[PDB]
Design an enzyme around this catalytic site. Structure first.
Site, mmCIF file in Angstrom:
data_model
loop_
_atom_site.group_PDB
_atom_site.id
_atom_site.type_symbol
_atom_site.label_atom_id
_atom_site.label_comp_id
_atom_site.label_asym_id
_atom_site.label_seq_id
_atom_site.Cartn_x
_atom_site.Cartn_y
_atom_site.Cartn_z
ATOM 1 N N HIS A 38 35.567 -0.132 55.961
ATOM 2 C CA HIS A 38 35.676 -1.437 56.842
ATOM 3 C C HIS A 38 36.639 -2.265 56.105
ATOM 4 O O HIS A 38 37.215 -3.055 56.709
ATOM 5 C CB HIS A 38 34.033 -1.961 56.720
ATOM 6 C CG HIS A 38 34.051 -3.505 56.821
ATOM 7 N ND1 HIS A 38 33.535 -3.591 58.271
ATOM 8 C CD2 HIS A 38 34.308 -4.531 56.633
ATOM 9 C CE1 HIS A 38 33.516 -4.836 58.559
ATOM 10 N NE2 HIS A 38 33.931 -5.540 57.657
ATOM 11 N N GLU A 39 36.512 -2.552 54.662
ATOM 12 C CA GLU A 39 37.570 -3.597 54.081
ATOM 13 C C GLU A 39 38.940 -2.921 54.366
ATOM 14 O O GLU A 39 39.954 -3.964 54.151
ATOM 15 C CB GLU A 39 37.178 -3.785 52.600
ATOM 16 C CG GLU A 39 35.794 -4.352 52.495
ATOM 17 C CD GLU A 39 35.364 -5.415 53.252
ATOM 18 O OE1 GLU A 39 36.317 -6.366 53.450
ATOM 19 O OE2 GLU A 39 34.063 -5.457 53.507
ATOM 20 N N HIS B 48 39.962 -4.193 57.741
ATOM 21 C CA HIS B 48 40.468 -5.318 57.605
ATOM 22 C C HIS B 48 41.837 -5.751 57.044
ATOM 23 O O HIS B 48 42.597 -6.301 57.469
ATOM 24 C CB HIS B 48 39.459 -6.153 56.783
ATOM 25 C CG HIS B 48 38.188 -6.666 57.697
ATOM 26 N ND1 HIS B 48 38.298 -7.373 58.522
ATOM 27 C CD2 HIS B 48 36.909 -6.278 57.251
ATOM 28 C CE1 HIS B 48 36.996 -7.651 59.069
ATOM 29 N NE2 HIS B 48 36.223 -7.132 58.402
HETATM 30 C C1 LIG Z 1 24.845 -4.118 53.546
HETATM 31 N N1 LIG Z 1 25.268 -5.315 54.005
HETATM 32 C C2 LIG Z 1 25.855 -5.490 55.194
HETATM 33 O O1 LIG Z 1 25.752 -4.662 56.040
HETATM 34 C C3 LIG Z 1 26.397 -7.086 55.673
HETATM 35 C C4 LIG Z 1 25.727 -7.579 56.824
HETATM 36 C C5 LIG Z 1 24.201 -7.277 56.464
HETATM 37 C C6 LIG Z 1 23.329 -8.149 55.494
HETATM 38 C C7 LIG Z 1 22.030 -7.763 55.380
HETATM 39 C C8 LIG Z 1 21.305 -6.807 56.267
HETATM 40 C C9 LIG Z 1 22.110 -6.526 57.393
HETATM 41 C C10 LIG Z 1 23.720 -6.382 57.450
HETATM 42 N N2 LIG Z 1 27.689 -6.691 55.951
HETATM 43 C C11 LIG Z 1 28.918 -6.851 54.936
HETATM 44 O O2 LIG Z 1 28.557 -6.896 53.702
HETATM 45 C C12 LIG Z 1 30.228 -6.698 55.353
HETATM 46 C C13 LIG Z 1 30.860 -5.470 54.612
HETATM 47 C C14 LIG Z 1 30.607 -4.070 55.052
HETATM 48 C C15 LIG Z 1 31.708 -3.120 54.366
HETATM 49 C C16 LIG Z 1 29.208 -3.577 55.039
HETATM 50 C C17 LIG Z 1 30.922 -7.896 55.246
HETATM 51 C C18 LIG Z 1 30.202 -9.035 55.591
HETATM 52 S S1 LIG Z 1 30.885 -10.449 54.853
HETATM 53 C C19 LIG Z 1 30.453 -11.063 53.576
HETATM 54 C C20 LIG Z 1 28.890 -11.349 53.274
HETATM 55 C C21 LIG Z 1 28.636 -11.790 51.721
HETATM 56 C C22 LIG Z 1 29.913 -11.946 51.028
HETATM 57 S S2 LIG Z 1 31.275 -11.364 52.098
HETATM 58 C C23 LIG Z 1 32.413 -7.851 56.093
HETATM 59 O O3 LIG Z 1 32.044 -8.079 57.324
HETATM 60 N N3 LIG Z 1 33.492 -7.567 55.350
HETATM 61 O O4 LIG Z 1 34.954 -7.476 56.317
HETATM 62 ZN ZN LIG Z 2 34.202 -7.364 58.334
#
Ligand SMILES: CNC(=O)[C@H](Cc1ccccc1)NC(=O)[C@H](CC(C)C)[C@H](CSc1cccs1)C(=O)NO
Ligand SMILES: [Zn+2]
Ligand SMILES: [Zn+2]
EC number: 3.4.24.-
Length: 447
Positions: free
Chosen positions: A22-23, A26
């Site tokens: 994912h990153e 990005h």
């Molecule tokens: C397991 N964590 C996630 O799935 C969360 C969303 C979420 C949270 C809680 C419950 C369900 C979903 N998503 C992310 O962490 C993305 C990373 C991907 C690679 C998984 C991340 C979200 S941004 C930020 C959140 C906090 C600091 S930066 C992203 O978009 N980077 O481009």
């Molecule tokens: Zn993202």
């Protein structure tokens, strides 16, 4: 110990890979658009592995593997050199920033495509959806479905294996009836039957939807024959050798293997009189099951692996293609998975799928351990499924997610200026609060 460590290791590797892809989407799309990427953080918390690239990009492996991010160059976060202004994220078009934001979930989808393509290049096995046994007074028993029937389609969608059958059955939660195109194994004379699902009730986390319909699939048959006996075990101390046939257990003949399983599990310590046959000679033995740690109570072990006969290859499918064909079929499969995740979220929100049966991180880790134990051809589709899930839940319109970024960006594109000055910040914090609350509730329903 030896099990939980493997579970955690597989879970961490799966996380790491998905966060990285994912990153990386990005970061790649951002760097191609002309902005400068600063931090490539894979994980949350205190950093552990910091490295610096020639272009100034810092790659960081942290300790909390439940997320990640890509720190862009933006004038709204640091003072920028007047020449690097056009290398900033805020000084780009709405379309470029929208593409950079959407790259992440698209990167997860592309990773799912790649995983399924690699699986198709290496080949994934499978069994044909052929019914072996039918439980009376069930969903399928009342629909004129007889044993030996090969399922051909569910609501028109092709179902070449039991996996696709279950995948289409789960998509029918909340419906009052479904239509199944079936045919007898061998004859291509199709017939549409209708399963009544009005009183249908099953937990997808705990119950197999096939068994919920009263259907047992035809699989490898277990036979009361000892394959091998582990050393220093209860069966070894009972005199049982490899190749013996359990005939009678406590006066009654042994008809099924589940009978012996339940007798060993529910009767620890107490003797079992086994009348067996060895090289055509009848013998009597006394098997005393041990008492190894179990779940709920004390289960019994004997150290016996039965002899299984695999079903004939007539009920076997090989799903390997060529490179181009594998690309096409992997794209189709991941698009199917995306649509199914959309429909599943719709079911969960509409009010007919309980949220307590949600995939919790401990269940995710146990599944990762099981899959990584099964091999690569199973671990890769698991990674693809979880990648589709992560990419689709992060495109959810919520301030802290990629989807909220896209939403506020589209509102800026229409309005001609960013939505909120600081009116966002009070949602920026509330979205993190909601995310932590969702994580806690998902961890608790797993326990
Ligand atoms: C397991 N964590 C996630 O799935 C969360 C969303 C979420 C949270 C809680 C419950 C369900 C979903 N998503 C992310 O962490 C993305 C990373 C991907 C690679 C998984 C991340 C979200 S941004 C930020 C959140 C906090 C600091 S930066 C992203 O978009 N980077 O481009
Ligand atoms: Zn993202
Ligand atoms: Zn420049």
């Amino acid at each position: 110990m030896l099990s939980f460590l493997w579970d955690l290791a597989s879970f961490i590797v799966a996380l790491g890979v998905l966060i990285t892809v994912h990153e990386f989407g990005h970061f790649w799309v951002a760097r191609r658009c002309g902005v400068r990427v600063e931090r490539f953080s894979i994980g949350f918390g205190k950093a552990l592995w910091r490295r610096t690239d020639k272009l100034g990009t810092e790659y960081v492996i942290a300790l909390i593997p439940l997320g990640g991010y890509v720190k862009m160059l933006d004038e709204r976060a640091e003072p920028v050199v007047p020449e690097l202004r056009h290398h900033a994220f805020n000084n780009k078009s709405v379309g470029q920033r929208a593409a950079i934001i959407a790259a992440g979930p698209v990167a997860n989808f592309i990773f799912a495509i790649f995983a399924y393509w690699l699986v198709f290049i290496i080949g994934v096995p499978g069994v044909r959806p052929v019914v072996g046994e039918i439980a009376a007074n069930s969903i399928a028993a009342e629909a004129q479905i007889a044993p030996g029937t090969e399922l051909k389609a569910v609501d028109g969608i092709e179902t070449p294996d039991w996996d696709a059958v279950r995948l289409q059955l789960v998509d029918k939660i909340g419906d009052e009836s479904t239509t199944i195109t079936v045919a007898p194994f061998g004859s291509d004379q199709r017939r549409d039957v209708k399963l009544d699902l009005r009183h249908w009730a099953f937990e997808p986390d705990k119950e197999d939807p096939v068994s919920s319909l009263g259907i047992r699939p035809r699989g490898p048959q277990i036979e009361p024959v000892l394959e091998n006996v582990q050393p220093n075990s209860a069966a070894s101390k009972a005199g049982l050798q490899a190749g013996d046939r359990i005939v009678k257990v406590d006066g009654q003949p042994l008809t099924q293997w589940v009978t012996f399983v339940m007798l060993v599990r529910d009767n620890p310590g107490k003797s079992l009189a086994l009348e067996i046959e060895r090289q055509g000679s009848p013998l009597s033995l006394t098997l005393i099951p041990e008492s190894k740690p179990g779940n709920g109570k004390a289960i019994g072990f004997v150290g016996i692996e039965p002899k299984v006969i695999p079903l004939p290859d007539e009920y076997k499918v090989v799903r390997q293609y060529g490179p181009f064909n594998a690309i096409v079929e992997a794209t189709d499969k991941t698009w199917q998975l995306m649509k199914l995740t959309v429909s599943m979220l719709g079911k969960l929100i509409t009010g007919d799928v309980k949220l307590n049966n949600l995939s919790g991180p401990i269940s995710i880790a146990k599944g990762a351990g099981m899959t990584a134990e099964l091999g690569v051809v199973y671990y890769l589709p698991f990674l693809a499924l979880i990648s589709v899930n992560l990419g689709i839940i992060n495109l959810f319109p919520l301030p802290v997610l990629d989807g909220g970024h896209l939403l506020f960006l589209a509102i800026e594109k229409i309005k001609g200026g960013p939505v909120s000055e600081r009116v966002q910040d009070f949602c920026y914090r509330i979205g993190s609060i909601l995310l932590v609350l969702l994580m806690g509730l998902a961890l608790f329903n797993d326990f």
